[PDB]
Amino acid sequence: MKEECLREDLKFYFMSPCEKYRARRQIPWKLGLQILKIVMVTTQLVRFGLSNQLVVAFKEDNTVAFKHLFLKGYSGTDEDDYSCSVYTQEDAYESIFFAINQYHQLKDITLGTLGYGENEDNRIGLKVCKQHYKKLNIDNDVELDCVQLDLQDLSKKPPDWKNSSFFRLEFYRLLQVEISFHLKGIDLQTIHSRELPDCYVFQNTIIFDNKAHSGKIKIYFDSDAKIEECKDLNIFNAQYVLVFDAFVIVICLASLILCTRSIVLALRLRKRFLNFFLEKYWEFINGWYVLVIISDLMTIIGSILKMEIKAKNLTNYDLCSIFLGTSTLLVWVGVIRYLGYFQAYNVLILTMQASLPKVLRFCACAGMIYLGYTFCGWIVLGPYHDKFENLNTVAECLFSLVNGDDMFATFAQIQQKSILVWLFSRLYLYSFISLFIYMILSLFIALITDSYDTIKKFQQN
Amino acid sequence: MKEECLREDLKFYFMSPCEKYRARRQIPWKLGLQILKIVMVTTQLVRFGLSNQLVVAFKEDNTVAFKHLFLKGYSGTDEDDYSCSVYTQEDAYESIFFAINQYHQLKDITLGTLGYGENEDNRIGLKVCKQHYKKLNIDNDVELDCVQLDLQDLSKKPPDWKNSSFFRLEFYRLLQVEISFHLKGIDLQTIHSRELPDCYVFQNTIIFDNKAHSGKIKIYFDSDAKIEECKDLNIFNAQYVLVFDAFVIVICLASLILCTRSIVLALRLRKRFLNFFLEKYWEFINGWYVLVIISDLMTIIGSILKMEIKAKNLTNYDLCSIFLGTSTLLVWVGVIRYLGYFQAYNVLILTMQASLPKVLRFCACAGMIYLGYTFCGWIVLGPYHDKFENLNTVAECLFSLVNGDDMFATFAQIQQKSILVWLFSRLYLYSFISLFIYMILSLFIALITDSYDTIKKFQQN
Amino acid sequence: MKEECLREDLKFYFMSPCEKYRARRQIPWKLGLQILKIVMVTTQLVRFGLSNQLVVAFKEDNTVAFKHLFLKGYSGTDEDDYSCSVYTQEDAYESIFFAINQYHQLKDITLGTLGYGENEDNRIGLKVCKQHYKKLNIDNDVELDCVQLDLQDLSKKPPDWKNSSFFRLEFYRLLQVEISFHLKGIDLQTIHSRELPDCYVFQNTIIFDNKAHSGKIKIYFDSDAKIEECKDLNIFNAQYVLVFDAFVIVICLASLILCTRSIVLALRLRKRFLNFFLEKYWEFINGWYVLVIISDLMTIIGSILKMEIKAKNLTNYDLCSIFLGTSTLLVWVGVIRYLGYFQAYNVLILTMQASLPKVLRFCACAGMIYLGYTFCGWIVLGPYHDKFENLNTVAECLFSLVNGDDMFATFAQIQQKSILVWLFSRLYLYSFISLFIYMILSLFIALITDSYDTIKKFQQN
Amino acid sequence: MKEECLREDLKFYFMSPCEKYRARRQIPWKLGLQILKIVMVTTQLVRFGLSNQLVVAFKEDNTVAFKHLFLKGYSGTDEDDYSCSVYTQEDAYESIFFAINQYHQLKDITLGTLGYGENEDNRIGLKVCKQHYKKLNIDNDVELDCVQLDLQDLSKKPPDWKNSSFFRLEFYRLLQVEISFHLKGIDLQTIHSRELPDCYVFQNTIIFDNKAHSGKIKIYFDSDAKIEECKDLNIFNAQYVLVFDAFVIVICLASLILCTRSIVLALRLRKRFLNFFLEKYWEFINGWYVLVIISDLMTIIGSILKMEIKAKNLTNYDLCSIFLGTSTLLVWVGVIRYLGYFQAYNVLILTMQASLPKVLRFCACAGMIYLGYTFCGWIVLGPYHDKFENLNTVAECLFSLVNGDDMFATFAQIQQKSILVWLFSRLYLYSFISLFIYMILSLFIALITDSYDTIKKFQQN
């Protein structure tokens, strides 16, 4: 009879929860737990996205306002990773002096709720530091020299800092000039909700940088905002977020227990089944359960990081967003397990799994050609094309070209001044596009759609 | 003999009108009615589009002229949903004062036929309203304060409004400043046709908005134009439009009667046929007739809304255009019924219907992956990418990426300042594009083109 | 024996010229004539393109220089079909006065070889014409008023034209102001080749246009250049072009004779062959010969127009370029006849011809859906999208969308201010793209590639 | 027994090196040599790319700074191949005078380590040369006139060069004005590494060019930088690069010997095998070895050019980069030989080789249509479209259109001013896109994927 029991157990382990309830009236509380997990994970992600969106928007708006206030002739958009640049010793001095003067007159210029902030030494003021190669006759040692400009110093009606010997820069040895100051800000966008407003501290540095010594000074503006207590403010939900993240952890922790319990009970049946198939003469490792375990781990980690961020009032949410986003992606991918219960949808999951090994084998061959083209394009078209400047950019450009993106602009960005490089670029682009788009991907398509012929006839039989 | 009669009736119901006329000399006046309906529906839509195009063009041109007249240093294109922005207390005051001064000198500045308009209180002038948080020590109650500036007040040779205590704004509590005025305009573009010119009233508001309190004031210019009687004007087709819309209603109403009569007579034959197949041992619901009924309903509704709009002289034609456009789309789709009479074209309508269920089943699986990627991309790349700012934008970006659109720019819009987010964006984009473009759509293609193998061999047999 | 003669004739008519020479030693002078025709037609087209490219470049460069000289604050690129626009009565007067003043000082401002030209009345000067509605109280009659400003009038040291009653414009009735003048130019780019330089006459009009009466004056600059004799010039190939165009006509005329002779001799064999198949019990109309006849006609017409243009010194080469370009396209398409002699390439011409009827039948069904979407998109998204403004633009936008072009920008160009139209645009774009790109074109592909299965197995058997 | 020996030799020659070592314990030192070659070739290319990237970046940054210093009102981006342009005799004089004045005040304006350089005559100064047609009455001989402006001449407090008769240009005969000077620069970006800094000499020419005589002067700025010894400089790895390039040559030279030895031993076996198949009754030319020989030749040539460049301190690395990049591309393509040892990957290399002849035969037919469309589009749309200006641009535009790139912009770049050309452009673009994208490429796909059906069933059998 134990043979019949083993057969009935193996039949039970292979049927859908709907069929389990139809047959043996076993309630699918694990399925309900998973649906609840989907709903709560998505809810937590959406709430987190909305709140952190608000905070990031406030910080970026303040940074843009600071750039308009302190960078002379700022166009409103960054030239590059740096905000603006100058090419003349006079434009350089005017940019520096403009920044200092705008800081002096901050209260009469700003449109927001800005104020001067105490620095790291607990004194309101402006710090200017400059680095020179100490001296045609220059040593490699950099001579740093700083000055602390108070509000009293800048507010002297005859200004003495402008004429001081500090601001006479020898631009041929200059490495950089850095201006540092602190500002205190309040977002009044929140007080309509009776929430006490959040007070932020901005640590701003303007770097007038010519490490390149190529005739251009690049001006970088960096604003680092942190959240501090509102020391002085009179304006006539932390628990709810924290408990919700605890419920998400508990549910995800419970799903970890149930899935691992399910996997263990599956391996027990494999042990039993081999016994009946050792005397008479991935099936029990569900690949969906591995995905569910990874998703639960990532959701727990992301929730712990989120609670830590909210507890100690931090504003960088990158790593927590990367864990929560990946876990949500995997949860929504794992919903495909419930659809695959209905065999009508299963034949479409099987057609992808069958095509995967041929795709991987084919990527090995196409990958080598792709790498060769990447190296060639970087070494040749690097000095003459902005889509080929470094290797990572070349890889992305070739990927986009394979997908047809921006072909004419890519062809037209090579100036015909060098005839040899122009001819080579034409040959390179034509050969890469023809080869990859018309042999490589056609063979690839052919491999996949026809492998999907066999799953289609294999399920018919 | 009644069996022969039933067979002849079922044979009659299944033959094309061309065959009906060839066999029993029955004139296809229903087909002629449908062709007339196609022609008149398209004619009405084209006439409506041309006229409303004219009106919208006039309104937009006047709005652009107003922005150039009243917004200081307007670049000619909107920065965003708002027209322009300022970052300094002095630029803010100059924008406000420029708007007021340009309104004062309107007659000497405008190039069109503009005049001052009486406001809601029937007095020519300008209204300025400002909102502050009533008072570091601010309450949540907003204190509104308005002033009505007449033409006499602005025309005083020593201007007193500039120096008044109203325009001393405390920008740290300011919520917004709103300037409201009315203008009367005439389009003389019509008088070449003996038509009396249409006189419009523009209700203009300029909003100097800093609800964000982020250091930037956004300036919104909104012009609401309505059509009024020309009270004073001396310049040395309504019936035709209204009757035409009545004929469109009648024809569409008639097509509703005939199609519903046809459907009822079809269900009678189903009743009869089952009787012969209950003793001896969608075919009668034509899916085209459902489309024709929906199209007739939408055309009647759109025509009624159109007549209402023309009767009471309204200028918002959105809902009427959405009904008329959808009804015209459905009419031109329904022309495919006449082509499908010829079986040579029928095998191509059958190949799409057969492929539809597999497409829908496949969308369920691909939709879950798409949703997971949407959530992940929004939560992670939202703060660092303008194509991922909100969920709807992320969905559109992923759709465009699947279709290959703007891949290199999408790859290049992530600044490499955060190495972790940059690496994740690379992984995210590569995985999404590879997965969707090379497994998902290949299986999809394979499903559809091969299902079109079976209709092709199924019609051969 | 006449039966054997008929069979031998039909065998002769169906073999390639290479086989004709291999068998009966018949020289293929017709093939040599066709190769000569290809070479000479392409040569004529290339020479014509190079010369007319030079002339067009000169004219466009002069027009750009004129726009910079006479249009105030010209940005260097046209705003629209019009060059620039103004919105103020003062900017309007300054633009007009700037144009007149720059004309007065032309000799001291121009960088080229420009001079004043006599007008249609043979007098050097400037003409200003203005149109008003003759007079709140305006009649539909337009009152035109012109003034002729001589160089003496503009050169009076106290200028009297500025203060004259002519230039007091009532902008509320103004239709337009037009400024007309002539300039004489010489291109010295030619004298390096001993060719006498070509002297051109520019007829320039500046139109300050506010027919719309919408508050904006659009400024159009039109320069019409013609070539005249150099009356006064001292600088210390017409036959060759004309004879070459005569040889092209002769060769194309000869090819017309030979092809029509070939077609007639083909129809004689059809007559004979039916006689043998009327007692015993496109094959003779070569579709390539129709193409060759059309190409010869077009080349002769284009050459005649080209000779006429060169004879009477005209500078508009549009119609001649459209005939020559189409004839060259058809010649290079007709080269496919020689490749199709080798049966290895023939099976690829047969696969396209076989697929054509299914493509045409399918376009009829897809065309109706395309038309419905075009009408719907124009009526709804016309007022809110610049890619949907008129019907032709909508058709091009839908074509590009089917080919995947600029999908994200199309999705993002609809402002979300109107929620109803925004939702409809989302639904419209998603439905059109999904439908056309994933059912319509998949069925199409499937039709074509599989019809190419049958030609591939039909030639095997 | 010699028959058995011949069979064993032929079996040895056809087995993979892994199988050779598995069977006869023969170490695959040739395979190890090839892997070492891959690693060292890639290493050399990456090092070369990084260093030449640094040098090119320095030169381009200095050129940009020079353009900002000496070109008046330079926008920061080049208008075209020329940097900027002027249209007035006054803007022309101001640009020339601005360049000369900025050169005079170089030491007080530059942000980098710039100094005056001795010219070709070994004298510090500025040279201005002008070309006129010597004199309505102009001869074809160009009269060149130069002036050498010293620092003493420009530094005279009353400047005499401005008022001199040299700078009175007759712009109607002017061909060009050229300003030439030398600058000495040092990149201090290197001294942090104890490397003595590299001193560069810049030979700058500003060309005020109006050869066209079309009313516009184009201003070209060309900077030619070379590396010279630092004559005067006090700042408190050549061998390693040179030896590494020698090892790359040796390894590539060795691979040439081994591959050619392998090919010869292969042809010996062909000779022997035919003997056994001459009495009883590409297989021995490996196509990979041809690729390896070509790659070794190119790597040796590129390394020799690289050593020559580094030895004599040259800064143009184009030809050397084209040889090294092509050789690296071919090395990474040749790695596909090792994967093809495993027959699982071999069937994917065989499917491409089998499809190649059909692709080539098909390109001959499609190429003729492509050429016809190219000629037609250039001759017709050349004067009205910037993507059709010359034949090479037309070819690239049609290639991009076939790949779907920028279709709507291509459709919209034709102004509707000429109705005939506009209609023809619509017809041209629609016909080309429909034809090529929907018949030509569908037949092509069909040819390739189905040929990949036969290799797939041919390897099964």
Ligand SMILES: COc1ccccc1N1CCN([C@H]2CCCC[C@@H]2NS(=O)(=O)c2ccccc2)CC1
């Ligand atoms: C992610 O891999 C890559 C990512 C970025 C660049 C190159 C590659 N690889 C992959 C192989 N080659 C690809 C080149 C262009 C597209 C066709 C080839 N396959 S695939 O689409 O990317 C693919 C990969 C994995 C699963 C499914 C499909 C080239 C090197």
Ligand SMILES: COc1ccccc1N1CCN([C@H]2CCCC[C@@H]2NS(=O)(=O)c2ccccc2)CC1
């Ligand atoms: C309209 O649906 C969508 C609209 C917008 C985004 C996503 C989806 N869906 C649909 C399924 N998935 C699609 C992802 C990219 C394209 C391939 C998949 N099918 S489809 O082209 O859009 C389709 C749908 C219905 C009928 C015919 C074809 C993903 C979720």
Ligand SMILES: COc1ccccc1N1CCN([C@H]2CCCC[C@@H]2NS(=O)(=O)c2ccccc2)CC1
């Ligand atoms: C030139 O015709 C058109 C031109 C412009 C717009 C629409 C159509 N038509 C044609 C049919 N439909 C097309 C819609 C998008 C593309 C697929 C359909 N066929 S096709 O590519 O254009 C084609 C036509 C003739 C021969 C070979 C292929 C839609 C209406």
Ligand SMILES: COc1ccccc1N1CCN([C@H]2CCCC[C@@H]2NS(=O)(=O)c2ccccc2)CC1
């Ligand atoms: C490199 O050749 C070309 C390069 C640039 C323009 C035109 C062609 N040719 C080639 C043939 N025709 C092409 C037109 C558009 C694309 C389809 C046709 N084949 S292909 O992709 O370029 C191809 C070629 C060789 C091997 C594999 C594939 C048109 C003339």
